[PDB]
Write a protein that binds this ligand. Structure first.
Ligand SMILES: *[C@@H]1O[C@H](CO)[C@@H](O[C@@H]2O[C@H](CO)[C@@H](O[C@@H]3O[C@H](CO)[C@@H](O)[C@H](O[C@H]4O[C@H](CO)[C@@H](O)[C@H](O)[C@@H]4O[C@H]4O[C@H](CO)[C@@H](O)[C@H](O)[C@@H]4O)[C@@H]3O)[C@H](O)[C@H]2NC(C)=O)[C@H](O)[C@H]1NC(C)=O
Ligand SMILES: *[C@@H]1O[C@H](CO)[C@@H](O[C@@H]2O[C@H](CO)[C@@H](O[C@@H]3O[C@H](CO)[C@@H](O)[C@H](O[C@H]4O[C@H](CO)[C@@H](O)[C@H](O)[C@@H]4O)[C@@H]3O)[C@H](O)[C@H]2NC(C)=O)[C@H](O)[C@H]1NC(C)=O
Ligand SMILES: *[C@@H]1O[C@H](CO)[C@@H](O[C@@H]2O[C@H](CO)[C@@H](O[C@@H]3O[C@H](CO)[C@@H](O)[C@H](O)[C@@H]3O)[C@H](O)[C@H]2NC(C)=O)[C@H](O)[C@H]1NC(C)=O
Ligand SMILES: C[C@@H](n1c(=O)[nH]c2ccc(C3=NC(=O)[C@](C)(c4ccccc4)N3)cc21)C(C)(C)C
Ligand SMILES: C[C@@H](n1c(=O)[nH]c2ccc(C3=NC(=O)[C@](C)(c4ccccc4)N3)cc21)C(C)(C)C
Ligand SMILES: C[C@@H](n1c(=O)[nH]c2ccc(C3=NC(=O)[C@](C)(c4ccccc4)N3)cc21)C(C)(C)C
Ligand SMILES: *[C@@H]1O[C@H](CO)[C@@H](O[C@@H]2O[C@H](CO)[C@@H](O)[C@H](O)[C@H]2NC(C)=O)[C@H](O)[C@H]1NC(C)=O
Ligand SMILES: *[C@@H]1O[C@H](CO)[C@@H](O)[C@H](O)[C@H]1NC(C)=O
Ligand SMILES: [Mn+2]
Ligand SMILES: [Mn+2]
Ligand SMILES: [Mn+2]
Lengths: 324, 329, 325
């Protein structure tokens, strides 16, 4: 009865009109979806062009994985977030080579076109791309409900341009990440748990928010029932082996407005469950402990932090072992 | 969990551009790891043991060839499966419905498909008579593999290879058993009534949907659960099917991506499914005999394409009566 | 007793090997004997007088020709009957369903609208249109309703000499909308045998001449007696290029008839063939309620009739009709 659930099981019995590169507006949804013309315009645009995901790469760094990476940092960002990206470049997103355990960094961007009243910062983006060589940008509209598109297109770039990275971190450009804690965690892993790695702040048996004022509002007419297990809150860590299997399976899952929920549907179709790890505190530390750098040593991700805070915490963290 | 299903999905991952990050085609030594992973292997019948141990070998060569069989482009290539000692079945087909012709644009050619019946399996050495029969009629194709029941999908793959290298321009292909009567006249009339689009992906026969593997150990099509699990794809079986040369060239290309299966007609269905096509049922394919009440009326043979099964004498008799059934019926 | 039947039976005896024991094709003086052997000649309408007086003439020349229009072997020859002042009709077809693209060619079939019949001189305009689109065929005869069967014959001649290789031929009016997409799907859905003797359209059986003097298809009894053969009329029909030459060769054996579509039926009947009815040929229109719904068009092949702007409109409402039907 809900549109996405109705169309997903239709897609499923196919694998037991194209849904991948039919890029004209499907207008059948206007009469099929109850109350279409009253929904917010993001639902309208999401349902009209759900069946198009063959968008091209505008800005690429094809040599980013010329040397085999051990951990690929892939940070979701928007065009005007220059300070966020530069803070990450200087703090936890530094590229390293501490023993051929190469850590590489890319930012994942869509477009902020002039027709959506975005200011033209494209000439500034290219200068940033030339100088830091860490920008990947595709020609889709970088909107909130196009973030699963951002997920799939990044998975495609890994299959073509970085298929041999050992591990992959994917997060938001406003989360602080303890990369030192992540590296030692990865190094401490058996090669059977490393193969199917997917950890984060996992939530089980969650349903869609129906309050039309909240961020993740999904009406019953669009989706029905409960969400599969999914890591959320702005960061999860998984294997490059799982990343390749993930991208292959995206063909059999329709896009979903919530990107972290879409990634849980792909893991489920693969017969896996994301593993909860307490180190992903997508809800912040208590204000009492924010002044104690030692409250950061044993976590892996804390949301959210401003560009100044990320540089400050990273600087204090470098000499934290002498105080904790 | 079954062995064939497990190995075929391994092959799907090998050919998938994303998921792919010894040969299954020319590894002709015994594949001994099947003795460990196939539960109850050494208790399986001999044909199952030999099928699993050499499943990865299909690069067999022609010992007898008719390389100029399709010099003139044929409208209908008749490809009849046969065994070496079936001299009477083949000769009866030559004199009856398997006659070659050049009737005004519509050329019909004929080949018999043979494997080996070697002396080490106690077969009588009939190679001299076979070479004599080949030189006389020039319609025998023979490959250097053991012609057993569980190697018929090998006979299927090797014939498609021969079509792609020696008869690619044939408009249509009929493949059948050497004991089925085929109304070639009715088949030609049906082929000529086809729209240009229906003739490109033509594949008709006696098709069965949602069929499963026979689990009785004593029947002819027995397949245990250690070998195959689940249901069969749709496939035409029971004596013969009809399809286009365009389809045959597509079929041979896809054969590399499908592991051999002990039932040849099932294997062809697996290839069709992988190609995205579905074989179409045609009621003229009587893989069971005609009703006993009508098995004597020559009328019953004007309106079918194929009937199973007829002895060599019966084929000649029915065909002779067909040459005048237009006035009687 | 009737004139055309009596004269047709004379032709049938002359063309029979056995029964054979002025011309009827290039006698272009007034056949004055019809004034006495046709009872009531003086009181017939003027179109019947001119038809009876020059029935035995048909060696008219090509004033404007596109000689290499079929230099590339066409899959479909679009032949449209049109009158010289119909510039809007022809250009609307050129931009819509008559687009020359399985290569498709297009020709418009015209006679002469001479000044002696009080026609405005549009010759300079026609030559400009012909020089710019290269799709005008015009013969030196009076383009009259009762001369349309003569239009059929001269076009069939032109096919046999200037475009004999065409696979299929469509012949229609310049005011009918034709779904070029749909009809091409029908043509590719044909076996060769059926594609060799194809002749489809709105076929009528056991039709007769209308005898009411004030109707358009009025034919008096002194001209034609009996019923009509099966014939396809009402806007257009589709047939094979092989059938076209079989049609031209035997037009010599059939006297011209005032009703062009009936004449083609007589030509087919003398060939031993029967035209095949096809419900996709809606010579009558479609129900007003089902109009505006573009799906009522992508199912049919021919609809009569539409104005120039409508043809351009429906053709563009068609290129997006698969989204909904
Ligand atoms: C995810 O990203 C994809 C790809 O970027 C997005 O899909 C694109 O979506 C846009 C809509 O935002 C769509 O644009 C429409 O194409 C239609 C084709 O007919 C047009 O109807 C429509 O034209 C409107 O916008 C034009 C430019 O603004 C105007 O020139 C035109 O007059 C129309 O104007 C309407 O909207 C403007 C708003 O500015 C308004 O001022 C006007 O009054 C009028 O109401 C669009 O051009 C693209 O076709 C899609 N691209 C592809 C490749 O498919 C998708 O929207 C994103 N998903 C989410 C959930 O955001
Ligand atoms: C389908 O056809 C293929 C090819 O014809 C066929 O594979 C062949 O199978 C036979 C077994 O029937 C293999 O022959 C054996 O190889 C092993 C190891 O080399 C030997 O142990 C066997 O020798 C035995 O038989 C000898 C008698 O000749 C005795 O001297 C000895 O004591 C043993 O009993 C035998 O040489 C052969 O290697 C393959 N050939 C190829 C090219 O792969 C397959 O069996 C057929 N499948 C079915 C299902 O029938
Ligand atoms: C069909 O087309 C033919 C060819 O145009 C028409 O024949 C033409 O008919 C006109 C009569 O309208 C003839 O003009 C006349 O000749 C007579 C005697 O010479 C004269 O008295 C008239 O003043 C006029 O000049 C013309 O000769 C004739 N053309 C030829 C070459 O035959 C015919 O009329 C048309 N038929 C119909 C049914 O409209
Ligand atoms: C999440 C990453 N992100 C991205 O990569 N593209 C985004 C596009 C939109 C947003 C986005 N979040 C919102 O609260 C807001 C304002 C929104 C508007 C309307 C309804 C719901 C939500 N819009 C975030 C994007 C980020 C922020 C880390 C870069
Ligand atoms: C079918 C065509 N055929 C062929 O071309 N090679 C064949 C090899 C074996 C057989 C074959 N059928 C059987 O019932 C039997 C006895 C069998 C033995 C063991 C298990 C199951 C079945 N063996 C048939 C072959 C034919 C007969 C028309 C030529
Ligand atoms: C039909 C095609 N047509 C053609 O090609 N030449 C024509 C010459 C005359 C006519 C024509 N229609 C008539 O109803 C009319 C006025 C007539 C008057 C008196 C009695 C009977 C008929 N005369 C049509 C011609 C057309 C129009 C699609 C191009
Ligand atoms: C198919 O090809 C394979 C390899 O291309 C052949 O395997 C060889 O078999 C010969 C037989 O004497 C051995 O000497 C070689 O050592 C084998 N090579 C390999 C690479 O395995 C096989 O013979 C062919 N199958 C046939 C011809 O039936
Ligand atoms: C995707 O492919 C389709 C058809 O191949 C094409 O129409 C479309 O332009 C492509 N998508 C984009 C966003 O260009
Ligand atoms: Mn956030
Ligand atoms: Mn049999
Ligand atoms: Mn009209």
């Amino acid at each position: 009865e809900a549109y996405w659930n109705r169309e997903q099981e239709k897609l499923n019995r196919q694998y037991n009109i194209s849904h991948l590169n039919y890029c004209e507006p499907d207008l059948r949804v206007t009469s099929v979806v109850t109350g279409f013309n009253n929904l917010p315009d993001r639902f309208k645009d999401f349902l009209l062009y759900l069946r198009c995901r063959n968008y091209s790469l505008l800005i690429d760094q094809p040599d980013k994985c010329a040397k085999k990476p051990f951990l690929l940092l892939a940070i979701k960002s928007l065009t005007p977030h220059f300070a966020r990206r530069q803070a990450i470049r200087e703090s936890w997103g530094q590229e390293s080579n501490a023993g051929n355990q190469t850590v590489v960094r890319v930012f994942l961007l869509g477009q902020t076109p002039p027709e959506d009243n975005h200011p033209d910062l494209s000439d500034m983006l290219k200068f940033e791309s030339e100088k830091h060589q860490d920008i990947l940008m595709w020609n889709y509209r970088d909107t909130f409900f196009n973030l699963s598109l951002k997920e799939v297109l990044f998975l495609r770039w890994v299959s073509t341009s970085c298929p041999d990275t050992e591990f992959v971190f994917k997060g938001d450009d406003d989360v602080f990440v303890n990369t030192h804690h992540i590296l030692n965690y990865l190094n401490s892993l058996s090669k059977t748990k490393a193969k199917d790695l997917f950890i984060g702040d996992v939530i089980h048996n969650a349903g869609p928010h129906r309050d039309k004022k909240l961020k993740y509002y999904i009406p019953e007419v669009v989706y029905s029932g409960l969400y599969p297990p999914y890591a959320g809150g702005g960061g999860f860590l998984y294997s490059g082996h799982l990343a390749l299997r993930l991208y292959h399976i995206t063909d059999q899952v329709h896009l979903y407005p919530i990107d972290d929920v879409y990634t849980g549907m792909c893991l489920q179709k693969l017969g896996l469950v994301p593993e909860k790890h307490k180190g992903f505190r997508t809800f912040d530390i208590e204000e009492k402990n924010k002044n104690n750098i030692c409250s950061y040593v044993d976590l892996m991700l804390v949301h959210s932090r401003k560009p100044q805070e990320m540089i400050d915490i990273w600087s204090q963290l470098q000499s934290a072992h002498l105080k904790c």
